[PDB]
Amino acid sequence: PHRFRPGTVALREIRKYQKSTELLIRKLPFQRLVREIAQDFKTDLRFQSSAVAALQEAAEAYLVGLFEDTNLCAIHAKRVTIMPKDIQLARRIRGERA
Amino acid sequence: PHRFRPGTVALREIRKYQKSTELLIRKLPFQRLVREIAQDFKTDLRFQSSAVAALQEAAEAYLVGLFEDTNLCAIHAKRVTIMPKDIQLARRIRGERA
Amino acid sequence: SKKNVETYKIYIFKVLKQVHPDIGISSKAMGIMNSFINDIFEKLAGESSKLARYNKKPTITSREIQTAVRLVLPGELAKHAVSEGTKAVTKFTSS
Amino acid sequence: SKKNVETYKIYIFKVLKQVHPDIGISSKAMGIMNSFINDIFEKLAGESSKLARYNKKPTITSREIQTAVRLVLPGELAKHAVSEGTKAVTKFTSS
Amino acid sequence: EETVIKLQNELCPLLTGGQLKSYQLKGVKWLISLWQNGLNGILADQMGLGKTIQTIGFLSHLKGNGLDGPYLVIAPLSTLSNWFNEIARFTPSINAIIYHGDKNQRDELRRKHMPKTVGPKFPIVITSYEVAMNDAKRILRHYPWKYVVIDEGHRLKNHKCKLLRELKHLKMDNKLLLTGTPLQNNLSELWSLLNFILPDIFTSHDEFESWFEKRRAQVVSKLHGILRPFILRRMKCDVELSLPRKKEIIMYATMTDHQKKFQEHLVNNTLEAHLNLVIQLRKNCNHPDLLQGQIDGSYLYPPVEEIVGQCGKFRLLERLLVRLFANNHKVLIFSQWTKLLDIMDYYFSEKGFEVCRIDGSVKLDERRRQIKDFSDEKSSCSIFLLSTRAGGLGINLTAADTCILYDSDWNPQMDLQAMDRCHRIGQTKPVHVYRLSTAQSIETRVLKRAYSKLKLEHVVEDKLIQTDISDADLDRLLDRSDLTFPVKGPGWEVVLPSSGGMLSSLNS
Amino acid sequence: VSKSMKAGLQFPVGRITRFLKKGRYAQRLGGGAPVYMAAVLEYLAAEVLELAGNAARDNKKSRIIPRHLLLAIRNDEELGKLLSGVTIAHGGVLPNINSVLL
Amino acid sequence: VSKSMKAGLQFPVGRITRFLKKGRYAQRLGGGAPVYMAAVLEYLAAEVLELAGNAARDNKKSRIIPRHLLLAIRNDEELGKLLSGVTIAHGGVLPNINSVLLPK
Amino acid sequence: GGAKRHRKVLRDNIQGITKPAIRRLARRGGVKRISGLIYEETRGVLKIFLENVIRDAVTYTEHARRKTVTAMDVVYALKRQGRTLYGFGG
Amino acid sequence: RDNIQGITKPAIRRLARRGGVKRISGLIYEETRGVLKIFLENVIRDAVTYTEHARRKTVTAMDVVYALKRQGRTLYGFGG
DNA sequence: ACAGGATGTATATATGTGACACGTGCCTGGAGACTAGGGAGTAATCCCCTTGGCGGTTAAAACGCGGGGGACAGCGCGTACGTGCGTTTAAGCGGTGCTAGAGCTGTCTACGACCAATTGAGCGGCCTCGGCACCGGGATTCTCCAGGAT
DNA sequence: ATCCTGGAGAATCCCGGTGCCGAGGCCGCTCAATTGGTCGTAGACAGCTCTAGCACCGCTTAAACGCACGTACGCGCTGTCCCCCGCGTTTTAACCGCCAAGGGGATTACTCCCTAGTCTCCAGGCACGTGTCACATATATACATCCTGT
Ligand SMILES: Nc1ncnc2c1ncn2[C@@H]1O[C@H](COP(=O)(O)OP(=O)(O)O)[C@@H](O)[C@H]1O
Ligand code: BEF
């Protein structure tokens, strides 16, 4: 059969997800997580669907930026695969303390 | 004679400059540079000595932070010596475009 | 009965038809443009207010708005905006 | 003849002597503390003004200042500041 | 009798192996007349009456004379299997294909059984709601439809529903809305059914609203007369006397002290400290043990003895079960939520009683298999668990002798169609309806709302209810010789099938 | 005649004046401040719309979509610096892959 | 007969009221807003001064210097988060060396 | 007739962000190869960011004496943290 | 002209030592000079705009403080 | 591995000295009291909008397997960085002299808020049709392969 | 060991019909934009000043600069083996469909009590002169730390 190399499929996926410009995270699990985090602060809080959509968009943009910086860190270390130390270094340089 | 290793003298210098807490850049060359950069924008501009001192303090703090992030980048790359690519990566992650 | 929100949709459409007669704009892009314009307006108004409070001046004139534009907008954008604002103020005060 | 600038130097010294009777403060540290207090005051006032303009309320009450404190100050600092402010407001409105 | 037989033969030639009843013959003749005049009608009857038989006779007649056109059957998933079984049994030499399954399966069944053009052996397609809704724009739009039917037309309640749009995208000449309870919750929802069956007769909703104390009687008589030529209706008690009648008993049970302290913890918001509000109080009404278990986080079921003796009307439930086991009669149990069904199934498996459950998670093949083994005589199964949404629509469980509703839906027509699943044609023993409802709770409010909704369907003592039913009262309620016993009793109330409700003021 | 037509600007001068007076950024507002504000806002909107129209014509699309707006903003260095932290909804990122990755 | 004495706060209430009225942050100022502001500012100043005094006493210095202020701010986590972006003149940096850099 | 225990306890809401979702996010970012703990650290960072933004939005809602978190409150909370969202903003 | 070279190699070395850099490369000095020039250009442009707004010919320390605050770096002690 | 010497660093003491803190005149800002009005607190409606679950289905998610490409451990090198010393050059401190420029005070003066009437612009709603989304298919491109030449 | 060229297959791009829903044009109107007058206060401007910024000359000595080195570290190649990736399978959860209930957002009439604005007053706070005690500097001194040979 036809078994592609791990590089060409990754490149095709990168191109497809850079040209798609849609929501990559499922709406229901993200809504569950948002509701859980909100109940962690204060109970009996209702959410607007547009507010949850905006939260999902902002979270996706922030995670995309974090993955940008993590890929930059990994390429700087002469490594194609990203690692938790890359994410930690990106968070430390960006000033986002834990 | 007594010739120390490049590590112990560097450590002593780091400790001394971390405990000194003073101005490391000479005042006259920094003042010349500030006046040149100001004349580059607008001519016939006088400067207050306290303003130049504040500019020098802010520049020293910013350069110390940049060296912090560059050392973090270099240690992440398993290299003791900092390199221009480390400074470029730190500037790119911090969001300070050229 | 209901609040009539004030948006620059008609003016954005007019400017677009002025610069691009054939090209149209959707509703999402119109909302994004309105949000961007409102954010720029709020930022420049806050900067003008800060400038007026720094100089102990209760009034905000074209000078304060020009300074806020030069501070917020970078480089060529600021220069062209200052030129356009000066031309508009001159045409307004002349006629 | 000359402007008398208003600083919290005396009040900072009083608070220091209250918390640390023997420990003193220099002039540079006093100026830094005054600058920090002025910056916090300006930030909280701006946040209260933004909150009042968001809710279309011309008046700023203790609720707006409490919200600005909870927004600016992080975590335990915000909690303790809210507690102290509520205690002070209660003591003021009771007496 | 012989005239009905000969009329059935001369009208429907292919209809063999079964005889239409007098009312079935009148209904199929009414449908033929509606087809002749070209007016689409809403065939309606009680759940016990045979709605599929009259429609299948009408379809066989249409296949007999004239031409044979594409016929579409849109119905719930749990009833299309029974529809195919009845089209194989009551109507030989008539082809019918089930259009349901995966995309590839449905596509291959389509490309194999039915051609692109019309055909003499074109099978009558029987699909589901979701399948037809998804495949209308993709496939169904290409093939015409001379006659379509929609069983359980209460799905067409909302006028803004997506099924209406997907059917409007499709092209069909005639329609046939099949609904056991054509009228539903508030008002004017039937106009959507009227607008779908008759687009020109009822064009807008404001017209039906304008159609709408003496003038109230005048307008209800006017709408009853207007709905007469298009909507036919018959009851189980008036047309036939062969089927024994049903008895509805609301078995009230006092809320236990465990549930009492639960309810006080809810109203003062201290349940979570002990270990919307309407759904929480409802879960407190039926098996709050599972609520506290799921809020605790335990993976194991609580002790079965603790489960039955801790909360709920489970004690009265077990009393009813042992009494019916001594009575040797199959029972049907309907529940609103699947969690209640899971708890009951766990208890029954702990006790060893044979149980079969039919929910949405159960597939079509397993549904048909369970219906078959429950409708069997050798099978010792007596306890059959069902859901009010899936298992309470269109299935014929005649082998059972009584039904018990642990919960009551906000829409009373759903509970009615659920309780009338057992009382069908061929039920030899009298059927009893035991509607469980905890006393002095909000389930009483739900019942009052359901009865206020039943009032408009009909127009087309509290202290004695408070107590708990005793064993002597249980025995007085157990007898079946009355259907072939006061109207009010301690802890139980008898529903009047004609009229009346909990709040007679709103019912009038 | 309206102030917008008097100043030769398409943006509303009276509406911006009312907004600035309601926001109460200052006690008194000069006469040329709303005209200057309208001119600056009109120039910025015209620049952004021109770039978005160019991006849309590049994609053979007649209607401007959020993707075109984001591409036009991120491609230009000036608008990109002005809207660096801005995250446009329903819009992806710039199509770019590092050379080390290829 | 002073508001600061009535509220038991060392910071001036009238000065904060006049500042809020001059800044024109709101058209009308609340009655309890200046007292709340003074209380919050007094608590923040007290916390910062207590941390700086502890840092100075650890260094055997009687008077607080900007170095002690910066040390107390960087050591404290909540004040470090509140005052992350600020730089203190003549304060230096927090003494810390990475373990990889130190020879083991 | 399988033995039953209360079943299918929901996987944690932080686990709702599945591995393919984080993988797609990394592809959009421009990552080719992803390690194992990257998904867990991404879940943690997302949880921290959502905690901050949701705390700010809940404060904004409590200031307005409302029980529903509208989109404007989320937009203001994001603007406080630097990230400005133009689409859903009013 | 050569004022950017006024920031000499020992000064950058002391700054890196205060930062915590153990070994510094030879090419670090030019990059640090460029970064410092960019930062000073931004801050001085903002301060000059602030000064021109007030119709003054002398840059005040308050103007520099405001310019630094606009860029996110607030300086304490020199304000006022 | 341990003894010992050169280097840097921690430590107790004497004597400036310039910055911190305290006493004082006063003045401009803080404080007391009355008033009128507009912002704010509050009861009642309602109807758009949020919550919970069922039915199902289907594309997305998930478990398992083979291998191959990348992360990582180890070694030789030779080149760039660091350390110490003679030297020089520009930073810094002292002292004076000059003047452009920051800041305050008096005097109008042209410019902006307010309010009464109003009448034309934009926001609200129902077509309505054309730009755009999904689809079957032939054509083109990219890539995986085991071969083929040398 | 390359080094070019060969073909089947999965992926991708261009073209044709379509219908459908979101973009675009029209209209009664109503609330905000505009015009005419007034005023008293913010602002533009002429002038005295003094004080702080700019320029220069002389001694100096700490800091900067150039050079010899040798040694520690960045960097290229190699073996691997283990972790990520590509794909058939399945199963399980997203969602779109549907439904009654009801908590909750917004509005309008009202009123009332909290606050803006003004005259008067006097005490807290800031400017200026000043003596001293904490801290900076120099020198001796015991002691911790680093580099090498036995
Ligand atoms: N003429 C008949 N002879 C025997 N049985 C009949 C006849 N008509 C109907 N039935 C029975 O009624 C049932 C089919 O009709 P039914 O399921 O009640 O229609 P629906 O569920 O739509 O109301 C079957 O059980 C069938 O045996
Ligand atoms: F039509 Be169903 F069978 F009731």
H89 touches C35 (CB < 8 A): yes
Which residues, in sequence order, are CB contacts of E446 under 8 Å at separation 6+? E408, E410
Q: CATH code at D46?
A: 1.10.20.10
- Expressed in angstroms, the distance from the first to the final Cα of chain G is 66
Architecture of domain I4-70: Orthogonal Bundle (1.10)
Write out chain F residues lying below 8 Å of C44, CB-based: 37, 40
Distance CA E427, CA E245 (A): 10
Kindly state whether H6 is in contact with chain E, defined as any CB-CB distance less than 8 angstroms. Answer: yes
What distance in Å separates the CA atoms of residue F27 and residue D95, rounded to the nearest whole number? 36
Long-range contacts (CB closer than 8 Å, 24 or more residues apart) made by F65-74: F65/C26, F65/C28, F65/C29, F66/C28, F66/C29, F66/C32, F66/F90, F66/F91, F66/H87, F67/A21, F67/F91, F67/F92, F68/C29, F69/C29, F69/C32, F69/C33, F72/F48, F73/F48
Whether residue H21 contacts residue A25, with contact meaning beta carbons closer than 8 Å, is answered with yes
- Looking up residue G69, the CATH number of its domain turns out to be 1.10.20.10
Dihedral of CA F47/F49/F52/F57: which sign?
negative
For residue F20, being part of any structural domain is answered with yes
Strand partners, E172: E145
Atom of ligand 1 nearest to the CA of E424: 18
What is the bridge-based pairing of β-strands E231-232 and E42-43? parallel
Distance of alpha carbon D8 from the chain centroid:
11
E-state strands within D1-95: 24-25, 59-60
- Count other C-beta atoms under 10 Å from residue B52's C-beta: 18
Q: Which of E8, E87, E89, E396 to mutate to test the pocket of ligand 1 (most atoms within 8 A of CB)?
A: E396
Closest by CA to B38, choosing from E400, I46, G78, E300, is I46
For the domain with range E246-253+292-507, which CATH number is right: 3.90.1150.10, 3.40.50.720, 3.40.50.300, 3.40.33.10? 3.40.50.300
Helix axes B84-94, B49-76, angle to 10 degrees: 110
CB F38 within 8 A of CB F12: yes
Among the listed residues G30, B41, G93, the one whose alpha carbon sits nearest the alpha carbon of residue I15? G93
d(CA A26, CA E35): 50
Number of H helices, E strands in chain D: 4, 2
3-state secondary structure of E508: coil
Interatomic CA distance for residues E213 and E220, integer angstroms:
11
Structure tokens at D21: 């009777």
CA–CA distance, F40 with F10 (Å, rounded to integer): 11
F1 touches chain A (CB under 8 A): no
Q: Where are the domains of chain I?
A: 4-70
Strands I58-59 and B81-82: unpaired
B92 three-class SS: helix
Q: Which domain holds residue C71?
A: 9-94
Cβ pair E242, E23 in contact under 8 A = no
Q: Is G61 helix (H, G, I), strand (E, B) or coil?
A: coil
Q: How far is F15 from chain H (nearest CA, A)?
A: 18
List the one residue out of E392, E310, E498 whose CA is nearest residue E79.
Answer: E392
CA proximity to E500, closest of E248, E253, E182: E248
User: Could you give the CA distance from residue A30 to residue A35 in angstroms, rounded to a whole number?
Assistant: 9
Contact between G16 and G29 (Cβ < 8 Å)? no
**Cα-to-centroid distance, E51 and ligand 2 (Å):** 6
Closest Cα to residue F80, out of E52, B95, D77?
B95
Q: Are strands F28-29 and C59-60 parallel, antiparallel or unpaired?
A: parallel
Exposure of H70 in the CB half-sphere (CA atoms within 13 A): 12
Closest CA to D50 of D67, D75, D27: D67
Q: How far apart are CA I59 and CA B48, in angstroms?
A: 6
Domain that includes residue G63, residue range: 3-82
Pick the closest to residue G11 from D76, I75, D16, D62 (CA basis): D16
Count other C-beta atoms under 10 Å from residue D80's C-beta: 17
Intra-chain end-to-end CA distance of chain B, in Å: 48
Q: CB of B23 within 8 A of CB of B58?
A: no
Mode of pairing for the β-strands spanning D59-60 and G28-29 = parallel
Among G7, G12, G26, beta carbon nearest to D88:
G7
- Domain membership of residue C75 (yes or no) is yes
Q: What's the sign of the alpha-carbon dihedral A82, A83, A84, A85?
A: negative
CA distances from E233 to E30, E132, E242, E417, H33 (A): 12, 28, 19, 15, 68
Residue F102 lies in a domain: no
Residue D78 main-chain phi, psi, to 5 deg = -65, -40
Those residues whose C-beta lies under 8 Å from the C-beta of residue E456, and which sit 6 or more positions away, are E183, E187
Distance from C-alpha of A80 to C-alpha of A6, rounded to nearest angstrom? 12
Asked if D62 and G32 touch (Cβ cutoff 8 Å), the reply is yes
User: Can you name the CATH fold of H19-80?
Assistant: Histone, subunit A (1.10.20)
Q: Write the CA distances from H69 to A31, A62, D74, E145, H16, integer angstroms.
A: 13, 21, 21, 49, 22
Which residues are CB-contacts of E195 (< 8 A; sequence separation ≥ 6)? Answer: E159, E202, E203
Count of the separate structural domains present in chain C: 1
Q: In terms of Cα–Cα distance, which of E247, H31, D63 is closest to A70?
A: H31
Scanning residues 32 through 61 of protein chain I, those with a beta carbon under 7 Å from any atom of strand J turn out to be: 56-58
User: Which CATH topology does E2-232 take?
Assistant: Rossmann fold (3.40.50)
In angstroms, the CA E136 to CA E158 distance is 19
Task: State both tokens at E360.
Answer: 């949405």
Do residues H16 and A33 touch, judged by C-beta distance below 8 A?
A: yes
Strand E246-254 and strand E492-494: the pairing is antiparallel
β-strand partners of B85: none
Tell me whether residue C79 is in a domain.
yes
First and final C-alpha spacing in chain E: 41
- Is the CB of E421 within 6 Å of ligand 1? no
Parallel, antiparallel or unpaired: strands G63-64 and D24-25? parallel
Domain membership flag for residue F98: no
Is the torsion defined by CA of E81, E87, E93, E97 positive or negative? negative
User: Hey, CA dihedral for E378, E382, E385, E386, is it positive or negative?
Assistant: positive
Rounded distance, CA F79 to CA F51, Å? 10
Q: What is the DSSP letter of E136?
A: I
Chain G residues touching residue A95 (CB < 8 angstroms): 84
Upper half-sphere CA count for residue C87 (Cβ side, 13 Å) = 12
User: Could you tell me which CATH number the domain at A6-94 has?
Assistant: 1.10.20.10
Q: How many domains does chain G have?
A: 1
Residues F57 and F38: their CA atoms lie apart, in Å, by 28
Compute the nearest-CA separation of I76 from chain D (Å).
Answer: 5
Please give the distance of CA C68 from its chain centroid, rounded to a whole number: 11
Alpha helices in chain I (DSSP H): 9-19, 28-53, 61-70
Q: Which helix (H) or strand (E) holds E405?
A: strand E402-405
DSSP 8-state code for residue I8: -
**CA-based nearest residue in chain C for residue H72:** C35
- What residues contact residue E454 under an 8 Å CB cut-off, 6+ apart? E412, E501, E507
Residues with CB under 6 A from ligand 2: E 47, 51-52, 79, 151, 178, 180, 394
Beta partners for E477?
none
State how far the alpha carbon of E205 is from the alpha carbons of D48, E43, E150, E199, E267, in Å: 51, 22, 22, 11, 42
How far apart CA G70 and CA G90 sit, in angstroms, is: 9
Q: Is A78 exposed, middle or buried (0-12, 13-18, 19+ CB in 10 A)?
A: exposed
Per-residue 3-state assignment (H helix, E strand, C coil) for E90-127: CCCCCCEEEECCCHHHHHHHHHHHCCCCCCCCCCEEEE
Q: CA-nearest residue of chain I to B38?
A: I44
First to last CA, chain F: 62
Would D60 be classed as within a structural domain? yes
> Rounded CA gap, E363 and E368, in Å?
9
Residue with token string 């709920």: E312
Centre of ligand 2 from the C-alpha of residue A40, in Å: 48
Alpha-carbon separation of residue E345 from C47, E339, E342, E364, H55 (angstroms)? 69, 10, 5, 20, 43
Q: How is chain A split into domains, by residue range?
A: 6-94
Determination approach:
cryo-EM
Q: What is the biggest distance separating any 2 CA atoms in chain G, rounded to whole angstroms?
A: 66
Whether chains H and C touch (3+ CB pairs under 8 A) is answered by yes
d(CA I40, CA B37): 8
Q: How distant is the alpha carbon of residue H54 from its chain centre?
A: 9
Confirm whether C63 is domain-assigned: yes
Q: Locate tokens 């050569």: which residue?
A: I2
> Is residue C86 classed as helix, strand or coil in its secondary structure?
helix
Is residue D3 a part of any domain in this protein? no
Cross-strand pairs, E489: E492
Q: Is the dihedral of CA E406, E411, E414, E420 positive or negative?
A: positive
Gaps in chain B (C to N over 2.5 angstroms) fall after none
Residue type, A60: E
Closest CA to D49 of E81, G37, E181, C66: G37
Chain I: nearest CA to D36, how far in angstroms?
Answer: 7
The size of chain E, in residues, is 508
C-beta separation of I34 from B93 below 8 A? no
Q: Which phi-psi region, left, alpha or beta, contains residue D22 (left: φ > 0; alpha: ψ -120 to 50)? A: alpha
Q: How far apart are CA B63 and CA I19, in angstroms?
A: 8
Rg of chain D, C-alpha, whole Å = 16
